[PDB]
């Protein structure tokens, strides 16, 4: 989806602010060309679109679109790629029009899209172009949202933007309910090794597949095993065939990161209730079963790339080695004989990933330091210690080391001799704070990970995996989640429409081979042509029992959950179902941060900035207003003087705390003094 992106901003194009509210809108010529749903919800709405599923770029740079040219009310198949202009000249039908099985329409009047985008009923004599199929007005991501036509554009937009943020789990289960796009837009992603020419597997492994083609020549597909993505996510590809199988050309032969048996799978299938349980799922939060953590149902691998280089300094040459200045042997136990860590050694915040030392020269010692060196009889060790200590709050095994050397003739930037990168990995469990979110925009940080026993369970003791909240459902108009939930429970338990006496009325126009469906059987309702509500009720009424004589979900689609904590049952039946929820890439560990004294900017004497370093959160103008409105004067003086700028104030306060004295009175800030010298530099006598 980054490919297939249309961005009206850029060089030559109009910028952000200079672009008024007009171009952000959705002119009615975007239909079938640029999906009106998908777009960044930040301050770029409209300025970044994605192409429709079927669109295609005109050789001049226009966005052509397919249509089925129709004549005399006879829908042909002469697929025409009408451009953006000539669509206006014509009158364009709708795909979901009752064709009479031959190209003849059924009803006399038909909807149609007239020139300026106005909608009308024309009799079936003017209609000359009909849509190739529905969901033509929708992008690649949004096509993958089940029951899209029930959700409001707000939450559908949020869903299409959060569906590009799931992280490739370690287990990668496919979803009970989807659209058609989970497969085609998964082999087109590239991240699924595709059988090139039809042949037979000869030998497999977790690293390569050797397909024997029909005639002689063979081929070995090299799996990518644990390649760091560009955002720290694993990229395993395990193969999904056996040593005797026979693959056709163009076939899926190796799952990718989020593919299960070839098709997309951006999350798991989790039994979900819709009751507000004990306040923990308050206002978009989520409570979880602990089963997710035990069985690793939500568990992302992450692979971070640490990197240091040995430079050529004026004083000497940097040197990578176990030789380190004053340091224990325990903290140098994991390193090998030549610096870099041992492949496999677990690390933690403050370990020596690459022992690297540089010369320092000479500085007039402090005589107390000289006395201590005398009393202990240690040398000077003029080499200063700048090793690659793992940054704060990172851990996990060390997957692999990639080491370079100027000596080994590999090219590097100038003034560089040895560039070493230390790939580290860690298996983040799920955990409260993380940001799960369905496919319908309904998101929310994990609120609490309940134990498995105190989770509202069904009549079969089956606990529920997560517990969404009801008050988030109505006022957001995303009942797509509810319809997905019911259809997922049907897809799970399996149904059997009793065609004892003909076929029931609701299932008159269901497809065949949906009368009976096995348990755990996937389905798919494509976007604007899917299960109608009547079909959902009809399925749900016959939802064949599990193991005992037990239809756990009554015809309305709900159940009598037993409380896991108290013990009684709930007085009213609660909705249950299997709602496909992803694990967005807003993990807590990527956000948490703290600072008590860290680095400091060179030019200004303030704390440094951002989680990259320690840094400290901004204290803008609005917070100054708030803390004045409270009338808190001393706290404001603190935050502006002896936590940011009072250069001699910082060490004095740190001393005061450590010794237990009183915090001294803050001196003049630093930015004031700098501003004063700048003004005096402008020939403005300030005194």
């Amino acid at each position: 989806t980054h490919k297939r992106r249309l961005s009206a901003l850029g060089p030559g194009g109009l910028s952000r602010e200079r672009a008024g509210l007009e171009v952000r809108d959705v002119h009615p010529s975007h239909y079938g060309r640029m999906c009106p749903i998908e777009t960044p919800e930040g301050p770029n709405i409209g300025l970044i679109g994605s192409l429709s599923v079927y669109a295609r770029v005109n050789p001049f740079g226009f966005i052509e679109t397919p249509y089925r040219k129709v004549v005399d009310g006879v829908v042909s198949d002469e697929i025409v790629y009408l451009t953006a202009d000539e669509e206006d000249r014509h009158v364009v039908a709708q795909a979901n029009s009752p064709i009479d099985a031959d190209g003849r329409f059924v009803e006399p009047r038909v909807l149609v899209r007239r020139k300026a985008g106005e909608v009308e009923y024309v009799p079936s004599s003017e209609v000359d172009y009909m849509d190739v199929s529905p969901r033509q007005m929708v992008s690649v991501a949004t096509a993958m949202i089940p029951f899209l036509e029930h959700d409001d554009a707000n939450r559908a937009l949020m869903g299409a933007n959060m569906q590009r943020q799931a992280v490739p789990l370690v287990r990668s289960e496919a979803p009970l309910v989807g659209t058609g796009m989970e497969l085609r837009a998964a082999i087109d992603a590239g991240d699924v090794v595709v059988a090139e020419e039809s042949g037979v597997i000869e030998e497999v492994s977790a690293d390569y597949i050797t397909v024997m083609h029909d005639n002689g020549t063979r081929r070995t597909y090299r799996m990518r095993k644990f390649a760091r993505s560009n955002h720290g996510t694993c990229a395993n590809q395990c193969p999904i065939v056996d040593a005797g199988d026979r693959v056709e050309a163009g076939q899926v032969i190796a799952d990718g990161p989020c593919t299960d048996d070839g098709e997309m799978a951006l999350g798991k299938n989790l039994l979900v209730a819709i009751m507000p349980w004990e306040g923990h799922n308050y206002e978009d939060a989520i409570i979880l079963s602990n089963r997710l953590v035990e069985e690793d149902v939500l568990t992302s691998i992450h692979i971070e790339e640490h990197e240091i280089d040995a430079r050529d300094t004026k004083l000497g040459a940097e040197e990578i080695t176990r030789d380190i200045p004053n340091i224990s042997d325990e903290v140098l136990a994991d390193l090998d004989e030549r610096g870099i860590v041992r492949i496999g050694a677990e690390v933690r915040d403050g370990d020596i990933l690459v022992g690297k030392v540089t010369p320092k020269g000479e500085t007039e010692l402090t005589p107390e330091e000289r006395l201590l060196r005398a009393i202990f009889g240690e040398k000077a060790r003029e080499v200063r210690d700048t090793s690659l200590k793992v940054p704060h709050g990172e851990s996990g095994k060390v997957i692999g080391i990639r080491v370079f050397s100027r000596e080994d003739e590999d090219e590097l930037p100038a003034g560089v001799n040895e560039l070493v990168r230390v790939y580290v990995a860690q298996k983040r469990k799920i955990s409260d704070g993380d940001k799960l979110a369905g496919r319908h925009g309904n998101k929310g940080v994990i609120g609490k990970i309940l134990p498995v026993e105190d989770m509202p369970f069904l009549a079969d003791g089956t606990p529920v995996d997560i517990i969404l909240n009801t008050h988030g459902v109505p006022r957001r108009m995303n009942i797509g989640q509810i319809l997905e939930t019911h259809l997922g429970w049907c897809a799970h338990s399996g149904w059997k429409v009793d065609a004892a006496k003909g076929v029931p009325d609701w299932a008159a126009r269901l497809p065949d081979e949906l009368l009976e469906a096995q348990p755990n059987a996937i389905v798919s309702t494509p976007v604007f042509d899917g299960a109608q509500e009547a079909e959902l009720q009809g399925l749900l009424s016959c939802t064949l029992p599990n193991r005992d004589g037990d239809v756990l979900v009554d015809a309305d689609g709900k159940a009598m959950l037993f409380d896991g904590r108290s013990g009684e049952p709930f007085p009213y039946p609660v909705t249950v179902g299997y709602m496909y929820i992803m694990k967005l890439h807003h993990l807590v560990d990527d956000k948490i941060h703290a600072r008590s004294t860290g680095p400091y900017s060179m030019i200004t004497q303030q704390p440094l900035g951002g989680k990259a370093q320690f840094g400290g959160q901004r204290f803008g103008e609005m917070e100054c207003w708030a803390m004045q409105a409270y009338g808190a004067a001393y706290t404001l003086q603190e935050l502006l003087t002896i936590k940011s700028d009072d250069t001699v104030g910082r060490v004095k306060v740190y001393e005061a705390i450590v010794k237990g004295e009183n915090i001294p009175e803050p001196g003049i800030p630093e930015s004031f003094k700098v501003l004063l010298k700048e003004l005096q530099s402008l020939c403005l006598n300030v005194e």
């Binding site: 795909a95 190739v132 837009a185 050309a249 163009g250 070839g262 126009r509 497809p511 389905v523 309702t525």
Partner: peptide, 27 residues
């Protein structure tokens, strides 16, 4: 259908779309 290693995902679609989705990276 039309993709050989496909998992048999039953579908509710009432329509038979003539054209198949293009080569998504053609653009």
């Amino acid at each position: 259908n039309s993709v050989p290693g496909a998992p048999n995902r039953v579908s509710f679609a009432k329509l038979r779309e003539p054209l198949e989705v293009p080569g998504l990276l053609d653009v």
